[PDB]
């Protein structure tokens, strides 16, 4: 089997990419935040304490014939920006773009944080990490991905994220009309529960190319693109007036800048990320400070290759035996 789905962005910024989801029996349609650095399905509900909903589409589970209570079973999960959210446990039949998992785990938030509440286009998490980061107690759930892997043509998924523009999520195959030249493929560790790999270095603009290891992952999550702070401070050294600002929480820019590119190796070869991807836009509405999309990773305690990189690329998740990371201009 295979499944292929529109990821759409959420704003003018790109900040987040949402991707339809069919559950239950009637299909309830729900927008997920596919999420490669995470590993909960979780969707606003019927369960959802009500004023911690504010536009977002609820999955209701007792109108799901094919719904059932995950006995005993609740999740609570924390993500790197500091949000949160939490609840009780479902199965349900979880399509994505064509392809059907029965018996899915579906959390259900009884709780979310004031981020989830302020963004009504999201109406949960789609997790695509291993399944060894999962919350749920006592019982450990499988991904979405996991679930469906057997029955997968070939045991991957493949993000194509687009810049201001929609793109594409397919699960079994690799769309090979969909980048120029060829994938190079690299390792990955599952150490930490994540799509860990390591660059081979890194260029800013027409600039000569530093070959350095830089390990971090390929989270699909999170918008940004957080590298160590020499990297970071070579790339926003090259625009006029760019300074690191505590107050407003890193690099700015003006807003009058042109934006040099930059390329993140992999292996012998090369992604070049356009300067304009690495615009945020102001800081506040009518600011001519903008906001900086590579940033540090000091302080995180890992690099993070997320969505300023990854829409540069067409990105392989290989999940094989040995699972490892593929990615390709386009």
């Not at 790197?80 to 446990?89: E, H, K, L, T």
């Not at 401070?233 to 300074?243: E, I, L, N």
Request: some cysteine; overall charge negative; charged content about 10%.
């Amino acid at each position: 089997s295979t499944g292929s789905a529109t990821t759409t962005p959420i704003d003018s910024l790109d900040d987040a990419y949402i991707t339809p989801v069919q559950i239950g029996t009637p299909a309830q349609t729900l927008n997920l935040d596919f999420d490669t650095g995470s590993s909960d399905l979780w969707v606003f509900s019927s369960e959802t304490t009500a004023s911690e909903v504010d536009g977002q589409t609820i999955y209701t589970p007792s109108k799901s014939t094919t719904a059932k209570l995950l006995s005993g079973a609740t999740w609570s999960i924390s993500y790197g920006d500091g949000s949160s959210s939490s609840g009780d446990v479902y199965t349900d039949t979880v399509s994505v773009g064509g392809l059907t998992v029965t018996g899915q785990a579906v959390e259900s938030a009884k709780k979310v944080s004031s981020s989830f509440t302020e963004d009504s286009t999201i109406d949960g998490l789609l997790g695509l990490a291993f399944s060894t980061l999962n919350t749920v107690s006592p019982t450990q759930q499988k991904t979405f991905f996991d679930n469906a892997k057997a029955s997968l043509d070939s045991p991957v998924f493949t993000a194509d994220l687009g810049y201001h523009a929609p793109g594409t999520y397919n699960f079994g195959f690799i769309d090979t009309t969909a980048y120029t030249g060829s994938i190079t493929y690299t390792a990955v560790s599952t150490k930490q529960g994540f799509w860990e790999w390591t660059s081979t270095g890194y260029a800013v603009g027409s600039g000569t190319f530093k070959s350095t290891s830089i390990d971090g992952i390929a989270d699909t999550g999170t918008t940004l693109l957080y590298l160590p702070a020499t990297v970071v401070s070579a790339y926003w050294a090259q625009v006029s007036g760019a300074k690191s600002s505590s107050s407003v929480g890193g690099y700015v820019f003006p807003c009058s800048a042109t934006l040099p590119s930059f390329t993140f190796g992999v292996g012998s070869a090369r992604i070049v990320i356009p300067g304009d991807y690495i615009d945020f836009g102001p800081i506040s509405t009518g600011s001519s400070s903008c906001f900086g999309g590579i940033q540090s990773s000091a302080g995180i305690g890992i690099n993070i290759f997320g969505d300023v990189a990854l829409k540069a690329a067409f990105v392989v998740f290989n999940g094989a035996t040995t699972p490892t990371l593929g990615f390709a201009s386009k």
